[PDB]
Amino acid sequence: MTTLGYGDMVPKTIAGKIFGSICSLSGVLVIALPVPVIVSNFSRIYHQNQRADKRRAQKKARSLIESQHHHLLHCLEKTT
Amino acid sequence: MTTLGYGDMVPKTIAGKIFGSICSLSGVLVIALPVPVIVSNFSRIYHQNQRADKRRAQKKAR
Amino acid sequence: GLEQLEAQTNFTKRELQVLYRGFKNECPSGVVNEDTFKQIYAQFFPHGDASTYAHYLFNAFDTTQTGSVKFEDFVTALSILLRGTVHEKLRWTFNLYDINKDGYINKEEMMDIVKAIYDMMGKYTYPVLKEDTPRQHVDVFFQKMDKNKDGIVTLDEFLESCQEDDNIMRSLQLFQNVM
Amino acid sequence: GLEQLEAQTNFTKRELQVLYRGFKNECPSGVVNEDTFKQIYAQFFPHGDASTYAHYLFNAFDTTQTGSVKFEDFVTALSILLRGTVHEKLRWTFNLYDINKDGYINKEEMMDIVKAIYDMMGKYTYPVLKEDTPRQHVDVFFQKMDKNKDGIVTLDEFLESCQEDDNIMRSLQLFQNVM
Amino acid sequence: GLEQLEAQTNFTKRELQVLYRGFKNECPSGVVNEDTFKQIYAQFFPHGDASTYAHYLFNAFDTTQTGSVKFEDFVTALSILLRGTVHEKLRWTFNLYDINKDGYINKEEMMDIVKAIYDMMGKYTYPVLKEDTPRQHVDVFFQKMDKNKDGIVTLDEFLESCQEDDNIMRSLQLFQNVM
Amino acid sequence: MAAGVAAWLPFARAAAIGWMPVANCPMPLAPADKNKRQDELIVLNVSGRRFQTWRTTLERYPDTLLGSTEKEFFFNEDTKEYFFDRDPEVFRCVLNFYRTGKLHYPRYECISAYDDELAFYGILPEIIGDCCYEEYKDRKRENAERLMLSFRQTMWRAFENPHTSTLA
Amino acid sequence: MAAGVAAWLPFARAAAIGWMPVANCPMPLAPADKNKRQDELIVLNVSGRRFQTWRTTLERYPDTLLGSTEKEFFFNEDTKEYFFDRDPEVFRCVLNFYRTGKLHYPRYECISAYDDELAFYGILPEIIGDCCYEEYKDRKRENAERLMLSFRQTMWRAFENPHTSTLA
């Protein structure tokens, strides 16, 4: 089922051969179900962390009103 | 781990068989991590150069 | 309702629109909670801490005992503090000073307010800094504010000394024309 | 056409626009079928069943024998039921009661309508519930509605008792002013 | 400011809007640098080189010594060159000719300007081409422009011969009406 | 007759007349008549762009801004136009909520802009029509993600990030 | 009272009154009063399409075009309307920057068109809100990419491209 085929045990009937030939394809099919999602999520998490580090680095990159505003600040130095 | 299986050395215990069966799947898993990105970037660079040549040719139209 | 509120506060109609817009534009009228005062005030006082003082007039503005009151009860106190009567402004500030909400200010109690302002002053005092001097600045209060000479002050006992200090009756009337 | 219809119904122009809009807004004028009555009516009668009664005035509104008539023949009956003449409203309701479409109401026939209203009443009757009482409420009908004293009623035999019951000639005229 | 600039240059208001639009539309007012002159001018002189001459009035326009001056100091020289006074236009052109920025034009110095124009002429001169003739076209200059007969010219020594050549005082006034 | 929210109530008022003959009860209840006045085009003027709608469209949802009586802080009676200084490409979806009843999501709005418009107008994002609901959630999650002592503890701080100092 | 940028300053002016009793200092500073006048709807007329906004919205960022005093080269006092001969689908995002404070990116603009509008109005692309920032960078990179002697050197020129001549 895993397409190793050591060769230590091989069928020698005319029915065993049929069922082994079916078995190999069935293994190729069954095992090829996770390897899509697993590699997809590996890529997914790695690119997520990549954009995470670059986002943090981009973060590490980073009058008639002042009269009225500083008037308060003056008005606070009433304390001494 | 690479699914060759020459057959020159094969386990003959009842524990060695278990660990070999696990080993083969583990190899299929571990090696199938680069072959997504490598083939993706091969296709990527080839299509990039393809649109590059066609862009230069469209410039040679003008 | 804009009209039910115009006939309570001293503002006009236009000056109620012009600040409902400003209020709602920054907090889309859930209602302001402390976490909005402690930063709306703080953007006016850099080089200093504004949280611990804001945490007293937040309790003052809030007539009810919710954790966030309203807009109507916000402008209802803005109108008083700016264009209200001196005898009403003084009552409002008094309710701010009465930290135990009961009707009595203790020397250390209002010390809790002065240790907040002086905290808002800055990291380093411009002249020499003295930690016992917030201890006189409070007691120099009572020197006028206590016609009992006991060390405890109530609303009448707070006002009956605060109506002749001409300088504040001219600085309790600073902004009542600017707009 | 708005004008071919204004000169038939009692509504004005504005009140025909104002309800073509409402009609079309919920059913984009395919035409109403029962599956639209049984829910447009039912949204007015919670705590009750509205389907089995709606399934009689659906057959009433529908002058032709289609499965969904129109808008023109919808307002043509709205205008009658609201602002029509009493002698016309009564005929309309009569055509509703005549379930066998022939011109005769049997005691059990109109019982089929009263067992529909009382069904629309609710799950539990507010006072005591009695299943034989829909059996008197129908017969108390004939006590006026039968000048033959036979137990069968036709249009003249239905009206000639229904023009002096002042209370309905004031409740056949409830909505003819509200809008 | 549009008004602080109207009262300096000879243009009107409308003719200042109509060219701020044009200026800003191609260079969104960073400020023009040489790499913009050498192509804005060059689009007017095909079949020729416009860079090496543009690289003198770029230094002329630029009153300060930046690498890109402004818009205000752009129209301040446009207004002079088009609708300014002859005694001011002549001074401006003189400041263009004075390559060493000091106040003196040498025969080979202004030769550096004439070898630029004649370069702008084209690849092949329409009549016979002679490289010693830019050498007379400069000296024929001094034949008028030198009331000292020494071979060195200053602003007064440049103008005091350039005010009677009627043809230029009619071609120093070509565009002062077109717009 | 009446429009907007009470738009089908004439139909039920008409159907009611099916009862009056069999209604042996003495009297009915006199109706609920009160003051009357027609519909009118309210003129919303969202940042220069003018939207218009029947008032009875606006008052179908009365715990909101446009529906309640607190859109009177935005009335400019020198012109009789409601002027909102807001975005005019997201007031469209808000308005079509009031017309039909299902709130939508345009594929291409910066989800932050959409959320705070909904906040300002009173609408809740809970009520988004299901036709376009989960793509709102996709944008939501992607946006959220995009947003996401002397000595005895200095050793701790240095360990879990060797790139703090050189000793680590 | 005041609006726009100084919109919360009444709140601080009010809070200040908490000091006046305990303010033993002799005098305060008299206020900063000066000329006064109300807000008004500035009428931007971007290529036929009319936008409107309170003037105090425009003057929140004064190192720009619309905020500074050099949007007076675009005033058309025969009408009292600012007429810009620019694009009317990217002035929307520019304007919503002035309203809120975060500049956005519509998913579907030809990034060249967006960049040069930002250039013309004074805005810098640095300031784009993070909610929609890196898709701007994706479009940026893709667009950039889309944009991207006798004898002794003639041998060099012919070698590295055999398709120059036939001898190579």
Interchain proximity F22–D81, CB inside 8 Å: no
Residue A67 touches partner G, C-beta closer than 8 Å: yes
At D53, list the tokens. 């009664």
Of chain F, the end-to-end C-alpha distance in Å amounts to 82
Q: Which residues from B are below 8 Å from A6, CB to CB? A: 5-7, 10
Interface test with A, best of G1, G5, G24, G25 (most A CBs within 10 A): G25
Residue F22 touches partner D, C-beta closer than 8 Å: yes
Q: Which residues from F are below 8 Å from D178, CB to CB? A: 1, 13, 31-33
Interchain proximity G13–C82, CB inside 8 Å: yes
Displacement of CA D72 from its chain's centroid (Å) = 17
CB pairs under 8 A between D and F: 94
Using a CB cutoff of 8 Å and minimum separation of 24, what contacts does C118-122 make?
C118/A79, C119/C48, C119/C49, C119/C52, C119/C53, C120/A76, C120/C45, C120/C48, C120/C49, C120/C50, C120/C52, C120/C53, C121/A76, C121/A79, C121/C48, C122/C47, C122/C48
* Spatial CA neighbour of F23 closest among E9, C37, D141: D141
Q: Which residues from G are below 8 Å from E21, CB to CB? A: 73-74, 85
Q: CA-based diameter of chain E, in Å?
A: 52
Nearest-CA distance from C117 to chain A in Å?
A: 9
Closest CB to A80 among G12, G13, G25: G25
Helix, strand, coil percentages (3-state) for chain C, rounded to 5, are 55, 0, 40
Find, in chain A, the residue whose alpha carbon is nearest to that of G4.
A65
Interface test with D, best of F5, F9, F11 (most D CBs within 10 A): F11
Q: Which helix (H) or strand (E) holds C153?
A: strand C152-153
Q: Report domain extents, chain D.
A: 1-179
Nearest-CA distance from C129 to chain A in Å?
A: 9
Q: Can you point out the beta strands (E) in chain E?
A: 105-106, 152-153
Residue type, D47: H
Question: Helix, strand or coil for residue A41?
Answer: helix
* Spatial CA neighbour of G2 closest among G10, E81, E42: G10
Residue B55 touches partner G, C-beta closer than 8 Å: yes
Q: How far apart are CA C166 and CA F7, in angstroms?
A: 66
Q: How far apart are CA E150 and CA E169, in angstroms?
A: 26
The Cα-based distances of G90 to F51, G106, G119 in angstroms read 20, 9, 12
Q: How far apart are CA A45 and CA A16, in angstroms?
A: 44
Residue F126 per-residue DSSP state: G
The Cα-based distances of D123 to A25, D49, D56, D117 in angstroms read 64, 9, 21, 12
Residue F163 touches partner A, C-beta closer than 8 Å: no
Q: How far apart are CA E74 and CA E68, in angstroms?
A: 10
Residue C87 touches partner G, C-beta closer than 8 Å: no
Residue D167 touches partner F, C-beta closer than 8 Å: yes
The Cα-based distances of F71 to B45, E46, F44, G42 in angstroms read 57, 64, 10, 22
Closest CB to B7 among A6, A35, A39: A6
At F164, list the tokens. 């703090």
* Spatial CA neighbour of D121 closest among G142, F25, E170: F25
Q: How far apart are CA D25 and CA F60, in angstroms?
A: 14
Q: Which residues of E are annotated as a binding site for Ca(2+)?
A: 98, 100, 102, 104, 109, 146, 148, 150, 157
Interchain proximity D179–F3, CB inside 8 Å: no
At C2, list the tokens. 């804009």
Nearest-CA distance from F121 to chain G in Å?
A: 15
Q: Which residues from C are below 8 Å from F69, CB to CB? A: 1
* Spatial CA neighbour of C59 closest among G9, G18, A73: G18
Q: What are phi and psi of F76, to 5 degrees?
A: -120, 80
Q: Which helix (H) or strand (E) holds F44?
A: strand F41-46
Nearest-CA distance from C133 to chain G in Å?
A: 13
Q: How far apart are CA C159 and CA C153, in angstroms?
A: 10
Chains D and G share 3 or more Cβ pairs within 8 Å: no
Question: Helix, strand or coil for residue E162?
Answer: coil
Q: Which residues from G are below 8 Å from C96, CB to CB? A: 18
Residue F71 per-residue DSSP state: G
Q: Which residues from A are below 8 Å from B29, CB to CB? A: 35, 38
Residue F72 touches partner C, C-beta closer than 8 Å: yes
Q: How far apart are CA G121 and CA G125, in angstroms?
A: 11
Bridge partners of residue C105, in order along the sequence: C153
Per residue in F101-114, is it b (16+ CB within 10 Å) or e — as a string? eebbbeeebbbbbb
Residue type, C91: R
* Spatial CA neighbour of E158 closest among E146, E149, E171, E168: E146
Question: Helix, strand or coil for residue A65?
Answer: coil
Of chain C, the end-to-end C-alpha distance in Å amounts to 23
Interchain proximity G119–E21, CB inside 8 Å: no
Radius of gyration of chain D (CA): 18
Q: Identify the chains in contact with C, defined as 3+ C-beta pairs within 8 A.
A: A, F, G
Nearest-CA distance from F44 to chain D in Å?
A: 21
Residue numbers of the domain that contains F87? 8-148
Strand order through the sheet with F81-84: F49-54, F41-46, F81-84, F75-76
Q: How far apart are CA C90 and CA C88, in angstroms?
A: 5
Nearest-CA distance from F115 to chain C in Å?
A: 12
Q: How far apart are CA G32 and CA G15, in angstroms?
A: 17
Q: Is C98 annotated as a binding residue?
A: yes
Residue C24 touches partner F, C-beta closer than 8 Å: yes
Residue C164 touches partner G, C-beta closer than 8 Å: no
Residues D34/D54, Cβ–Cβ less than 8 Å: yes
Residues G72/E1, Cβ–Cβ less than 8 Å: yes
Q: Which residues from A are below 8 Å from G28, CB to CB? A: 75, 78
Q: Is C157 annotated as a binding residue?
A: yes
G122 phi-psi bin (left φ>0, alpha ψ -120 to 50, beta other): left
Residues F143/F119, Cβ–Cβ less than 8 Å: no
Q: How far apart are CA C178 and CA G32, in angstroms?
A: 8
Question: Helix, strand or coil for residue D146?
Answer: coil
- Tokens 């600017």 sit at which residue? C178
- Tokens 């996401």 sit at which residue? F148
Q: Is C41 annotated as a binding residue?
A: no
Residue G110 touches partner C, C-beta closer than 8 Å: no
Residues D161/D148, Cβ–Cβ less than 8 Å: no
Closest CB to E17 among G69, G73, G120: G73
Interchain proximity G28–A76, CB inside 8 Å: no
